Amino acid sequence: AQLPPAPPTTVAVIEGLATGTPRRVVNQSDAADRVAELGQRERIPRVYQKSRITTRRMAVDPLDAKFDVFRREPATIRDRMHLFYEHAVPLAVDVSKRALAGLPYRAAEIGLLVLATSTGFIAPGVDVAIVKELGLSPSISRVVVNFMGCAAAMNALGTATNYVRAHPAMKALVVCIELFSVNAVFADDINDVVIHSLFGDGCAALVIGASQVQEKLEPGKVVVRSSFSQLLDNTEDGIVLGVNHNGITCELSENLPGYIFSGVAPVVTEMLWDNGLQISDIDLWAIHPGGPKIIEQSVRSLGISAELAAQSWDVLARFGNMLSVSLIFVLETMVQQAESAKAISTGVAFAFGPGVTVEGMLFDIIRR
Amino acid sequence: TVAVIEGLATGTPRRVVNQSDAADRVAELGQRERIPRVYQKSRITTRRMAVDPLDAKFDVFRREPATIRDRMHLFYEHAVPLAVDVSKRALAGLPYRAAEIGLLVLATSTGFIAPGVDVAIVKELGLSPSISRVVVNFMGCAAAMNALGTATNYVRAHPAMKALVVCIELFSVNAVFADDINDVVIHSLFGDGCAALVIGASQVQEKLEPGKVVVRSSFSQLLDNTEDGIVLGVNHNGITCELSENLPGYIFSGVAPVVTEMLWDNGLQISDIDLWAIHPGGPKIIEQSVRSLGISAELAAQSWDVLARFGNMLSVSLIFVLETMVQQAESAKAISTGVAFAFGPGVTVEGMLFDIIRR
């Protein structure tokens, strides 16, 4: 009898959720005009009016008089990373606390901290600042997830999941922090012009715990039912992340939308089938608000009502695309306001990361 | 349930570099008398390098500013091949079908690209398109322990599944050879290398076959006021590590207290351990760890040896050592109890309690 040992039988729960962003508000129209001022600068207005973003928060003012000189020099990558650490700590610490404020868990109960970013990279970083700042344990476990793109939150929440189900009594803290403003450069190519028009800064934290299915979770709690991944075959050029002398950068392919259209439907369908569900059985669709073409093509693939992507369109409208963080902003909304009147709302969440990987999950929101 | 290292494999770029020569070739770049000094004290005889940073080709490129992007590309170009061959070899010995591998953890501190090695590995090895993936960056010399932890948790939540841990560290691709002393030290110590592990869950009962390593317990410790100890950053012309002069001291007064508690929590004493996989991060790192524990200088043989032959390969080094301990037993006992640990940023001591099944 060398059969695999019986599996844990609990379910990961998001007992605490919290979100935050730097204070400065950048109204998209103004942003467009400011950038438009850097022959034919008609390109600018054009791409911007198509973004479907009204406002974004930015830790740093790229086009500021001070930064504007710094912004145009080479080899500033090391300073930008410092600048990142500088602005991130305050924000990350503040959000982490909000996430924990509601729960009664004592610092000794938090055994794992997961930090995801694609806009950072510094020796001791935001992860260590968080531990000290919140007075967590010197022995707490830490995992830093980098360059996993817009879907990092998922890979991160999964790391937490395994941990929690493996150590039922402990809790885990998931934190995503994304500061692209600290990486602003404003180059000439469309990709740069586009990236700089879509990205915003923000932060989010989740507190995870293991719970038995017989337990009656309280309203607002979110159960993680299933997780999934998919390397979209032959789509490597879709989303590319790289480090430049003057900052981290993201390169998106003209085909990303197409890859999504082809990829989404099959992946969700198969996953839902495993859980005895169909697209028509989903109450909530936490589609990663990575941009119009992404939400747009994501909804077409699934063949659902445009309305069922309301929350997503909202986040993208108010905050733009703040990478791995965005997903969580969308979820929060869903948790604060019910989309129907049924106790427990079922929903699917998914985002897109490099290699063009669909990262997502099936969840339940206890309504009553 | 028990976490077992069922597969283990190491690899390295073909090029061998003799410290004696390196010292000379490097020196040739007013007080170059320092270079031979640091290199003699390194206690490194050789180390592998994916690239020859002094090569005519490279030498011009490395004197240039703003080259990280290309450098990161270079990482991918060399990292992939090596990481793939090492993974195949770690799995080669096991009877697992691609469907049984549900998690891939990739750790590095010397390269950043996406899609990266993790993706190149899945495709190359034909791993399931839906395998879970976690890329662990900038946790330095101790990433292997962070990575390994992510694997045991997984395998513990999904016993019927297996997890693959891959570490690739390629410092040579970041070689700059600058003036400051830290760059000199750092550059005389780091080597290139890769290592992979295959983890699975197992029933507390079951009798494991020789070679199998049971991960009994893992631990972490953020040392108070030590932040300056180990520092990683990204410069326009490469990635660097900035070791503090206070590091060895941190190590001296940090190791013992942690290890001792951890052991006490497992009904053990320093005097009970058979193996000590001390991360060979450098002569002082091994020196102060040994001294902090108050153990025979010899118990650190495996470490010294790896440091001697491959130099510091960051997270990779810790697995080479373990492999030596697996390949060659240190006594006639069935089951060898050992402790492993390395040091990472913020100055965090990360390690594990483990058993090596012998009979």
UniProtKB/Swiss-Prot annotation, chain B:
Keywords, alphabetical: Acyltransferase, Fatty acid metabolism, Lipid metabolism, Transferase
Biological or metabolic pathway of the protein: Lipid metabolism; fatty acid biosynthesis
Acyltransferase as UniProt keyword: yes
CDD domains, alphabetized: CHS_like
Catalytic residue list: 141 (nucleophile)
GO molecular function: acyltransferase activity, transferring groups other than amino-acyl groups
Entry-linked Gene3D superfamilies: 3.40.47.10
Important for broad specificity for aliphatic long-chain acyl-CoA starter units (site feature) positions: 171, 175
EC number per UniProt: 2.3.1.-
Positions annotated to bind substrate: 187
Record annotation: effect of changing residue 241 to A: No significant change in polyketide synthase activity
Effect noted on mutating residue 110 to F: Completely abolishes the polyketide synthase activity with lauroyl-CoA and palmitoyl-CoA
An example Gene Ontology biological process: polyketide biosynthetic process
Catalytic activity: hexanoyl-CoA + 2 malonyl-CoA + 2 H(+) = 4-hydroxy-6-pentylpyran-2-one + 2 CO2 + 3 CoA; octanoyl-CoA + 2 malonyl-CoA + 2 H(+) = 4-hydroxy-6-heptylpyran-2-one + 2 CO2 + 3 CoA; dodecanoyl-CoA + 2 malonyl-CoA + 2 H(+) = 4-hydroxy-6-undecylpyran-2-one + 2 CO2 + 3 CoA; dodecanoyl-CoA + 3 malonyl-CoA + 3 H(+) = 4-hydroxy-6-(2-oxotridecyl)pyran-2-one + 3 CO2 + 4 CoA
Keyword Acyltransferase included in the entry's annotation: yes
EC top class, as a word: transferase
Subunit annotation: Homodimer.
Similarity comment text for this entry: Belongs to the thiolase-like superfamily. Chalcone/stilbene synthases family.
Function comment: Involved in the biosynthesis of tri- and tetraketide alpha-pyrones. Pks18 catalyzes the extension of medium- and long-chain aliphatic acyl-CoA substrates by using malonyl-CoA as an extender molecule to synthesize polyketide products.
The protein, known as: Alpha-pyrone synthesis polyketide synthase-like Pks18
